């Protein structure tokens, strides 16, 4: 008797579906709606409510929405609620009637779209091979909403989508009325600028995203500095790739602005990062600092004076100079000398305490070498704040005046190895050691010039190694002129030394005269 049972379940399943298959209802309901839309502009809020309540009882969702939209438009046909919100919240106004009346209708639309999901909550989206009737009344409903020309309703709807946390709904909307809403809101709420930027990037309008991401870091909004760094770092990414329609010059114009601010913001961050963790600063001032630094990005003037220059943060002072295109060879160099000395000082401090130091601390020249590499890699070997013409001699002078050599087990040629490995051109290092070997300005005097030759011997050695591999054969007579002139220095030092290195010197001559052959 399973056959008789199926026919019993069939009639019941058909009885439930009946109310919707019926063409009488579809005709009655459509007729009641037609009559309401006639006197739409004269409906009392009490009647419009009762009507929507009854329409929902009968699963007439999409139609009830169309009544409320119609009563809205017909209560203010001149569209004053647009002129009200578009001008933006004119308080003490007669156009509060338009919005207040239109919203009584909009609140009912929300009621429908809520009861819509409730009745057909979790119900299936697709009958085997066909959409459900639940999904049809759903499709009918959200077609009325998204197609409407009443955009004040769309704004009130978008405000209510957000207030309900329906994020993915805003993004999925293909209307162009939503972008106007987010713009008016992104400028005063960070939570909304997030959407406007996420809307643009799904459309692949990356420039329009970086355009907002950048303008947000420059904002007066309560945003952390490290977040502002992210914004400017994403904007530089969104402004790195082509987007349909936008030029190359305006694209680079925005990438450059983002890169400028990002460079400062990293300085400001690394400054704030060090200032708070600096034991020399009073704990009371540190609270006043972070409130001033964390937040918007300040001028390089503010970063430099009240903080970086006082604390004698010579490394960040140089980074500020680079970011400010600060043309002054003296102050740039004076800061490099202080940076090296203060670095040598701290590193001799830690080694003395390790004689608290956690692990074997680094020798002075190692720590000084790190502090240089950090500025070389961060600023890309500028010709201004990294002037090899002056800085390399200073490092070579410090390597003598503070005895960072074989005496402590250090590579005597560590100042050359430092600049070569940093990317400095071989031809330039030798061009400096040439100037050091002749002038004989202290400390580069007397028998210590023996070490100047060592620097030249390896420098030129590291250069002939690079050209054999390079495949070339600027190096010329002038390098041979130097090695032969550097040979006289080794003999003039071998005589006045009559020293125990008399055999070390002799061994170097056999290396020099060999390099001269490789060049000639």
């Amino acid at each position: 008797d399973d056959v008789v049972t199926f026919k019993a379940q069939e009639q019941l399943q058909r009885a439930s579906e009946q109310a919707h298959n019926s063409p009488v209802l579809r005709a009655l309901l459509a007729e009641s709606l037609r009559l309401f839309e006639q006197v739409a502009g004269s409906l009392t809020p009490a009647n419009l409510t009762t009507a929507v309540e009854q329409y929902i009882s009968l699963k007439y969702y999409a139609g009830a929405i169309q009544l409320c939209l119609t009563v809205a438009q017909q209560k203010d046909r001149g569209n004053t609620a647009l002129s009200w919100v578009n001008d933006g919240k004119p308080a003490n106004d007669s156009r509060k009637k338009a919005f207040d009346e239109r919203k009584i209708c909009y609140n009912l639309i929300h009621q429908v779209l809520d009861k819509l999901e409730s009745d057909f909550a979790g119900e299936p989206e697709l009958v085997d091979g066909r959409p459900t009737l639940a999904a049809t009344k759903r499709m009918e409903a959200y077609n009325v909403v998204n197609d409407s020309s009443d955009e004040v309703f769309h704004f009130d709807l978008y405000e209510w989508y957000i207030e309900k946390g329906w994020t993915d709904r805003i993004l999925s909307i293909d209307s162009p009325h939503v972008i106007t809403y987010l713009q008016r809101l992104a400028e005063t709420d960070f939570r909304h600028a997030e959407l406007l930027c996420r809307f643009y990037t799904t459309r692949s309008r990356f420039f329009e995203a970086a355009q907002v991401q950048t303008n947000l870091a420059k904002s007066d909004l309560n945003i952390s500095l490290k977040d502002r760094i992210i914004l400017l770092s994403r904007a530089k990414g969104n402004a790195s790739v082509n987007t349909i329609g936008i030029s190359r010059q305006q694209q680079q114009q925005l990438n450059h602005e983002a890169s400028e601010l990002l460079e400062i913001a990293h300085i400001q961050d690394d400054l704030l990062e060090r200032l708070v963790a600096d034991p020399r600063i009073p704990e009371e001032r540190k609270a006043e600092i972070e409130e001033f630094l964390d937040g918007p990005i300040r001028t390089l003037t503010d970063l430099f004076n009240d903080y970086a220059d006082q604390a004698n943060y010579y490394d960040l002072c140089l980074l500020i100079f680079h970011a400010a295109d600060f043309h002054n060879p003296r102050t740039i160099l004076d800061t490099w000398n202080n940076l090296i000395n203060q670095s040598h000082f701290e590193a001799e401090q830690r080694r003395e305490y390790w004689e608290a130091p956690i692990a074997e601390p680094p020798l002075p020249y190692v720590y000084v070498s790190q502090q240089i590499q950090l500025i070389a890699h961060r600023t890309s070997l500028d010709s201004l704040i990294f002037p090899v013409n002056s800085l390399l001699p200073v490092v070579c002078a410090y390597a003598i005046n503070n005895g960072q050599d074989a005496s402590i087990g250090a590579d005597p040629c560590w100042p050359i190895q430092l600049f070569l490995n940093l990317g400095v051109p071989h031809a330039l290092v030798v061009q400096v050691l040439e100037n050091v070997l002749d002038t004989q300005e202290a400390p580069f005097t007397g028998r210590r010039r023996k070490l100047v030759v060592q620097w030249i011997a390896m420098a030129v050695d590291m250069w002939v190694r690079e050209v054999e591999r390079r495949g070339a054969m600027v190096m010329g007579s002038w390098v041979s002129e130097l090695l032969g002139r550097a040979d006289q220095v080794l003999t003039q030092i071998a005589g006045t030394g009559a020293a125990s290195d008399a055999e070390e010197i002799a061994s170097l001559r056999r290396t020099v005269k060999g390099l001269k052959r490789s060049v000639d």
């Binding site: 020399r280 600063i281 009073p282 009371e284 001032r285 006043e288 390089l300 003037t301 430099f304 004076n305 009240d306 903080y307 220059d309 006082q310 604390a311 500020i320 100079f321 400010a324 600060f326």
Partner: peptide, 17 residues
């Protein structure tokens, strides 16, 4: 741009009056 002004600053090593 950068503008050094060693004249009038705020003492970085003391709390405020």
């Amino acid at each position: 741009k950068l503008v050094i002004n060693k004249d009038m600053r705020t003492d970085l090593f003391s709390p405020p009056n």
